[PDB]
Symmetry: D3
Subunit: 222 residues, 6 copies
């Protein structure tokens, strides 16, 4: 039920402006399906990656809160994405967190109530610090945030768009490797995460904050 | 090799501005994988839908050329998307066709050279009028166009964003039902189709044409 | 819509007395499911059996009309099940054909409208003489008849109950081997085929005809 | 080795009168088969249902002993099935418990010695009060009892036949959801459970007890 | 039934000296198994390779008769394996053809009578010049020959053992790619093909012919 | 890095003489593949065999060190294969242990670093006395030893070649049943285990030791 009217620091949009995820998305793969067989195999594979350097990154990524995703792009972006160094940018990206994380995922989350892999398996994640929810797996709100942030970051810095998009992609993949999400939750999440950035471009406040981040970035360039 | 410098009526962007699809996307499911088993089952299911009213629409959609996608949104959009009735809009959407269809899909297309389902199966499509290519299935350039158009349309008309996005989604699904594309080609295509609309928002000409389509739409509203 | 009131030679029961197959049965396996993967493998296996002596029997069985099932038990039963030799018996078994074949399968048939294997595969059966329906596969009305007949036959001749039940079982298996039905259609059919024989035992006319078949069988025994 | 001659309170039939389950039934799905893959997925799905209201019922059903199945139909039947209220009926249903549970399942049970799901998985059931056997899974004697009871109940009260059959069906499904049995054990069990009610109708004592239950039910009706 | 006593030009060994393939080998994957699912996917994959340069080689290899395998190693071996150039060698390798092709595969061939992929699929091979047998697929006699020849060639020229073994391996893989054999037939064939070279080393005539091929090769080396 | 020059008691061959396993072998089945699905099912099946008499043997076999494989053939061979009773033979077989176990498996082992089943599953083996490695599963060095020993044993005693080869086969199968190895590791291992016996026949010391074992066996025969 929250939105910009209750939490204007974390949403630009209203409840009425949300992507209807329940309407747009396909249902998650069901148990008994081949597509779920594949979700399982992707789980086991990520599981085997846990011991690697990519595994290490995934555990780190899995430690990210919604709030740390913005700064999680710094390396892809080419420069620190921080309150200190890029305040107009940090503010932009923070203020859209729950537009992407909540508004864009909610109706499908709440309807399907899907069990996460670690919970399905009665194990823990690769990670494993908050009191982990077992549920509302589909789609991934974290992946929706990471994808939506990559799309707006790619627009601010098209010179590094590919690195940015790949980071965005990988944030979601980290959740699959660490056992937080099925591959399909993360895939579904990139669809709604894209849709919400269309809506954000209709929003005056977003528009203005984006201009500011662009201007900031520009001066940044010398 | 084409781009805006060779075909400025069908691209806003340059070769250098393209999404590196080969870099961003996962490889397509391989034969021997469970994920390919699923692509197959999705093929057979779409195949069984061919006889239905959804099957009818998919055959119609499958008749669309890149150029007919814009107008294919008219019902979702709420009003005719035509040269006659919405010229600023039609122009916008046409001019980005190959940004989405080509630039955003090319490196992965050309690298993987994937076989389409009808060709894999040695059958025809649900459709079946051009001399069908057997290949460069992954990702789908048609689905990339349809998704990217839905994202920019959703921005022009957020009141109908959900209907618009669902139409966009379904254009790609039509290609799976009709046998033109594997489900994974269409899924991959929505990722690059989103990425290219980020890039388009960095482009002055696009920006200006989008303002015009917005203004046109506005007067349209009475 | 037919029943005993329209076709009293082929039903004992009324429409109101039918097994609600749509209510009782699980849905058929869907395309995309592992259970459908198994239906497919059972298809291919039966297909390979077509060349054998069991294949020969299945083609013969597949030539049976509903009316020929009764006599199709003669060998299992131990003696000819014919108008000539066992008229009280033949009459009993004929008069319940559509109770089992129709009434007991109808609501699920008509609701699911499932595609038969030969039609799914765009091939023919092992058989292949009537104008084959592509559809209403689930459940199998022929298997429902064969199972229900085996149950009532087993009651008349418990000395040969095992041979009788195995024949009953195999009639349905013949339809899987020949490509007429998915294994799941035949399995579903044995459930409703059993349910309808419970109902038949509540029916005065059935009861009386069954007494006659028992008496006939008795004199048959010397 | 028991039968009516050793335990005439729990069998109507003799050893010689049993359904030869080993002869009639297909072998259970083997490990390495797709049909076993499906048994597994049905296990995991039931497992996810454990938390629901259907899960609650399944745990309750899983607490049933053979003796409590009769009364487990009371709601489907429309009235209490109890020694107190429906003694002729309760007696009928009790006296056939092991005809269905044992005689009808024995040869296949003992031959295949199949491992139950909880034991396969080295876990417990949804339930989990007796010292659980790991083995003789195929077919399910509990499901055979529940199905056979539904068939004879459906005959006593055809007005509620559909509710009765659905309850019967669900008793077996409870065992799949709770982890006691593979879906295939329960499916196999409905086949032999039907066969044994054919045999029961040949048995004088059963016939007479069934008449009594019918008469009792009749007076019950006012 | 043939052997060295009937065809001493094509066998060194007798019937009594054969590898009992039926005894040693596992059964082939059955339809309904996951291992057969994999045989199928390996079929489809080879099928897609048919258009490539590896596809070209496989079609060529598929044109080989048993008699042409020896010379088919010339490139791996480093020098022509021909009657003209390496007669002692050519003779050795020819004289063991049916030891490997027949004796080592026969009992399993004849027992299982397995259907080849092209026949299973009702299609042709990649090849497709003799009147193709549909059957005795398991194991592959051609692959048994190619593997057994690679093992004896590797012994004559250990400097090129790796190239030789890889050629040997690939001869069998060519049969999978071209649709002549399931992957499992070819795998099974390498087991019996190895076993028969153990037996060949017990055979005086083989021993002597092998000494001659070694001596010939030696002079070949300058 | 060891070989005959460092450990001449356990290798006949040098590093340069090794089978290039990385070059020859296919990659192991990947997670996400159907072939891995099959490796899993073979794991679960062996797992269910653990309780049987074959299970008992597999646990015993799993207790074998490389050094105990030679004597593990005594029953197949027909007579004790021991330092006491068959010293020339025991010496032969010992001296080739690491040719088969190490040299023939190394490059593929070290490259793929595959996880063993018990480790994949986070369980123990059927066995479970050394500090079990989790890794270098593909191919199995133990199976390579057992197969290579069966091939050289079959040559010494062709009268018992079939029993010998079947024992050889089963040694590897024991590792699958006990959870030490995937079926594919064991299959891959029989390929390289055959290749190394070709190389061994090029080695003077091996040749001479083999003559001695043959002579010993001969006198053994009376």
């Amino acid at each position: 039920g929250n939105d910009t009217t209750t939490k204007p620091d974390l949403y630009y949009l209203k409840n009425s402006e949300a992507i209807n995820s329940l309407a747009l998305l396909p249902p998650p793969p069901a148990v008994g399906s081949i597509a779920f067989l594949n979700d399982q195999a992707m789980y086991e594979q990520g599981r085997l990656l846990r011991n690697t350097e990519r595994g290490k990154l995934a555990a780190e990524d899995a430690n990210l809160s919604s709030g740390g995703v913005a700064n999680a792009f710094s390396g892809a972006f080419g420069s620190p994405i921080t309150e200190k160094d890029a305040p107009a940018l940090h503010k932009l990206l923070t203020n859209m967190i729950e537009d992407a994380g909540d508004l864009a995922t909610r109706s499908a989350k709440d309807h399907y109530m899907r069990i996460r892999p670690f919970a399905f398996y009665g194990v823990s994640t690769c990670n494993t610090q908050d009191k982990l929810s077992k549920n509302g797996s589909y789609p991934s709100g974290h992946t929706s945030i990471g994808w939506a942030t990559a799309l707006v970051l790619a627009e601010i810095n098209p010179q590094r768009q590919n690195e940015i998009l790949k980071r965005g992609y990988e944030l979601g993949q980290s959740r699959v490797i660490c056992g937080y999400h099925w591959q399909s939750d993360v895939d579904a999440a990139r669809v709604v995460g894209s849709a919400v950035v269309a809506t954000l471009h209709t929003n005056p406040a977003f528009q203005q904050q984006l201009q500011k981040a662009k201007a900031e970035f520009a001066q940044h360039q010398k």
